[model samples]
Target: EELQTELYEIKHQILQTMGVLSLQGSMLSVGDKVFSTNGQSVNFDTIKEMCTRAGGNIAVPRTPEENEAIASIAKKYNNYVYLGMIEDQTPGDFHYLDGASVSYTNWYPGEPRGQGKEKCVEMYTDGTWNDRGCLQYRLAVCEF
Candidate 1:
């Protein structure tokens, strides 16, 4: 009876998770990451708020594999997508939203070029990073 109860609880959890994902639309889980892509482009701040509401934050791709994985999903939209990295503290250098050191960067050539108001980072379709204005509207990639 205990085993049966545990199995039933596990099934319930899975169903609840699936229901949430289905309701959000285009949300998917890959390995340990859960992500969603917006159907319409929005500014970084709006995306960040939306992600928070969805129990996630803008994606912070910390490794080549993670970056590539997110890139795969972003490519389907055929446009740049907002990531969670930004030059919030120090100008000219980017860091994760959680304040992790700027490690394992995958910037494209001549990217994050220290231009005017280029504070937020976005992922190109090919998995490269570029700095852009925070107000620029782009599809957001939220991850948990």
Candidate 2:
């Protein structure tokens, strides 16, 4: 969960190390957001390893096929279950799939403007959660 990059470009080389102690870069798909401080992308193996070493474990949301199963259900029953389809997300945070869910730990003032009752979830447009919306629509970024 340390803010570590699998890779960092040359231009950002200096900043990547300074002030940005343990800074992480998120790689987003479509509908996901950085949900946890130790969040990573959607990979189950890491959890297995982490749990194996830490003597604790968590459950995977749905299997690949199970995930697909909801696709039609969402479309047919609840509109549509869009996966990896993000419209926006907190600029930078922990990765999801690593058990990260609904970040509010670092929300700015007056953010996450509720959409009828939907609390504004933190999402990054440039580098702040100034934007707000529901989680059903496709978003635009992710936390690494």
Candidate 3:
């Protein structure tokens, strides 16, 4: 069955934690949240609404492991992905949607140089990060 059960429904609220295998175009539940994508090359603004309609939010990484898992899934698309973060009040400064400071990050060296210019974050298929414009079309993966 390729390891990701049909029970791992993408749109429903998960009742129990489950793990997904490393299959292309499949979802990965690192622990509580599950990252799922359908390979849509969507812009940053549209991604959140798409994910929200699917009962999740845009994907964000809080640890290297989380980054790895998210990147692993994105690798199948062979494209960068818009992460669930953005520049906070301070230019070059970022935070979660709730405004909490990010405790972990994995920027590709010399990244986040936007300082209010780019205002968005994207993850390379190889797992490092870079800042870019939100208008660019990118893979939109959601975390449930």
Candidate 4:
């Protein structure tokens, strides 16, 4: 009984956070996914860990419209926002956090020339994506 009760509470924690994000109007619904942010200015690894603790992943834009929605929050900070996509060690293609192939892209002209050094990616307020260094500070957005 105690174990089951603990499980229930864990789910409750996520639901409660969802509510808080919605209350601040920091949440957006795109297709079936809910995207929100705690509005932290953090680096790549730190923001990813924060999202994991919040029961979601760093926001991954899978469509043109989804990318646009993520950009709205980027404007909230007026800063480049971290995204869940990263350049592979091989330096040729980007890999999503879930290990699935990236099905959508919104790269700015002649961008993403990171040469594997810039593993992290950030989105401009204009909705264009750029490869950036992982340690650079970026706005944190997550998806559930």
Candidate 5:
């Protein structure tokens, strides 16, 4: 129940922040379910893999350029939610706060190593921001 509440809160918060209201949303969990742009749902690792294999275009973080290029796409699909991506490490890509469509939050000072060409955006539960690999596919929210 508590988890559900948290999830609902997340949904409400996303809608509030983005000014989105009627888009269907869901989270990633283990199980099989229908996929649609109008509604939201959670898929497990297998679901993510299925989407990838089927060329469903999983969530990747947006670079500044990418964001600008896809501005129309974002605006068109602004009703969806982005659950973030999974990393190669244990946490599995912070798959709730960020994705190609939605960023986690603003960045902190001197954060997200800009050593060379990689740049990404993310928001954590503690309200922190970080740069990540744009190619890294994360969970995404969608609306049509």
Candidate 6:
């Protein structure tokens, strides 16, 4: 009986989250993260505002599994997706906007190595990451 009760609660939670996603227009749910993407490209600040208006923030992939999940969505749109990572004032080091320590990184060859030249991070459709100029516009993934 206890097992059945726990399952019921889990199912109810899933349904509730789904209801929220339905109202948010097309959204993809994966591993406790709900992602929403737009058709048009926008700069990092604009993307941040859009996600905030939709009750989410730009995505931060903390694990390889999460990175792959987000990469799948990027592939669907055939474009780069802005990540919430940025280089701190320190030249080569990077961290997520939420102040999470970057324990894992997936930079493509010769990246974040962009040093001060590029501060923003983006994920390519193939799951590779690159350091980019923050002003450059691209599709963005927001996590709820």
Record all residue pairs in model 3 with backbone atoms less than 3 Å apart, i.e. clashing. none
For every model shown, what is its TM-score relative to the native structure? 0.80, 0.22, 0.80, 0.81, 0.27, 0.80
lDDT of 6 at 139: 85
Point out where model 6 deviates above 4 Å.
1-25, 115-118
Error of 2 at 75 (Å): 30
lDDT of 1 by residue, 27-98 (tens): 666567777777668889999999898888988787787888778877878778888877855567777777
Please give, for residues 1-144, the per-residue lDDT of candidate 5 as tens digits: 799999999988975754432233322211222222322233434334445565564443245333232233334444222223433233223333233323433345666454334244433423345555454432343211
Candidate 6 achieves a global lDDT of: 0.81
What overall lDDT goes with each candidate model? 0.80, 0.31, 0.82, 0.86, 0.38, 0.81
Query: What is the RMSD of candidate 5?
Result: 15.9
In terms of lDDT, the poorest run of 10 residues in model 4 is 111-120
Tens digit per residue, CA lDDT, model 3, 28-143: 86877778888898999899999999998999999888899889877878888999888876677888776787778999998778645538899999999988788889999999
Model 2 weakest 10-residue run by lDDT: 28-37
The predicted structure with the larger lDDT, 3 or 4, is 4
Q: Which has the better lDDT: candidate 2, or candidate 4? A: 4
RMSD of 1: 3.2
Top model by lDDT, which number? 4
For candidate 4, the per-residue lDDT at 15 reads 79
lDDT of 2: 0.31
| Candidate 6 local lDDT, residue 99 | 75
